[PDB]
Design a protein around this ligand. Structure first.
Ligand SMILES: *[C@@H](C(=O)O)[C@H](O)C(=O)N[C@@H](CC(C)C)C(=O)NCCCCNC(N)=[NH2+]
Ligand SMILES: [Ca+2]
Ligand SMILES: [Ca+2]
Ligand SMILES: [Cl-]
Length: 313
């Protein structure tokens, strides 16, 4: 279609519109080479563009929110937790996602994203062919079936690593730095200082990204609703009145978009009845299986082992 070895998104976009053709990326083509390098995936995939998947595809629907990041059949929770964190700071999100992009205006089958690499912003261009099975995305999707920014972001990040398979292992902090240029620090929660709630509270209010995990030694599920060896996004911290004393809470989101903690302060916990109507509104309490839930600060430090904060420079 084109010879793209050193050409910008603008150049390629304009050329495709002139030629009246959908872009096919020579550097990261829609075939098995872009999926894996060693192990194959068990199911064989068809590559389709979002217009081929649904009638009215959209890049962004109702903003870029954490609810748009739902994990599929690829173990890249480390990266997905990081994007979800990033959506809590919209200001920073728009440096990674160019928002002037669309399926309904100047569509030429080509998109781009920006990552922070070796001390500068780097532009990554992709065709919009995505892996599918039975006409559904197999990897990351949004909970809205017509929204495609998070699927395409994953493709672009996979391209930056050489393949989808190259996203299988990783650390949330690697991704946080790729989105922000911040400096990461990690904390073992067993050596957590006495004031870590306060540290966590200051970090989210500053727009620092925060992930966490439970040490391991489709990932291991626990009866309490948590998942071991799995990256969670920390999406809020608050105190709430409950039977006289103020209880400290932590809000997490499972990047699966489902499977939540079921203990104290979970969605369907009966003793939410005892909490004031205005407080429930303040904490955006919702009984919906979206992967997001509140737990007590005490239960949090008991279960979780790693805490990762990416601070802005
Ligand atoms: C998460 C998932 O989708 O279930 C996925 O299994 C994963 O990548 N888990 C991480 C642990 C999280 C950070 C909690 C993991 O196992 N990481 C090991 C990577 C070792 C370093 N490798 C590279 N390439 N830097
Ligand atoms: Ca959305
Ligand atoms: Ca929930
Ligand atoms: Cl659109």
């Amino acid at each position: 279609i084109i010879g793209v070895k050193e050409k910008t998104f603008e150049q390629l976009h304009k050329k495709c519109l002139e030629k009246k053709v959908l872009y096919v990326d020579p550097e990261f083509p829609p075939d098995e080479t872009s999926l894996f390098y060693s192990q194959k995936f068990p199911i064989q995939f068809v590559w389709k563009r979002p217009p081929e998947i649904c009638e009215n595809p959209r890049f962004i629907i109702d903003g870029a929110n954490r609810t748009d990041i739902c994990q599929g059949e690829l173990g890249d929770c480390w990266f997905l937790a990081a994007i979800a964190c990033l959506t809590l700071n919209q200001h920073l999100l728009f440096r990674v996602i160019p928002h002037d992009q669309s399926f309904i205006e100047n569509y030429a089958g080509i998109f781009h994203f920006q990552f922070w690499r070796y001390g500068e912003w780097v532009d990554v261009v992709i065709d919009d062919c995505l892996p599918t099975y039975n006409n559904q995305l197999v990897f990351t999707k949004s909970n809205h079936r017509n929204e495609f920014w998070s699927a395409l972001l994953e493709k672009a990040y996979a391209k930056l690593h050489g393949s989808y398979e190259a996203l299988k292992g990783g650390n949330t902090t690697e991704a946080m730095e790729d989105f922000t240029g911040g400096v990461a620090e990690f904390f073992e929660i067993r050596d957590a200082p006495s004031d870590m709630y306060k540290i966590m509270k200051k970090a989210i209010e500053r727009g620092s990204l925060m992930g966490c995990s439970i040490d391991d030694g489709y990932e291991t599920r626990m009866a309490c609703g948590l998942v071991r060896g799995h990256a969670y996004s920390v999406t809020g911290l608050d105190e709430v009145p409950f039977k006289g004393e103020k209880v400290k809470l932590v809000r997490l989101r499972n990047p699966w978009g489902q499977v939540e903690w079921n203990g104290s302060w979970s969605d369907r916990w009966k003793d939410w009845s005892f909490v004031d109507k205005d407080e429930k509104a303040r904490l955006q309490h919702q009984v919906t299986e979206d992967g997001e839930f509140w737990m007590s600060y005490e239960d949090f430090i008991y279960h979780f082992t790693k805490l990762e904060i990416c601070n802005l420079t």
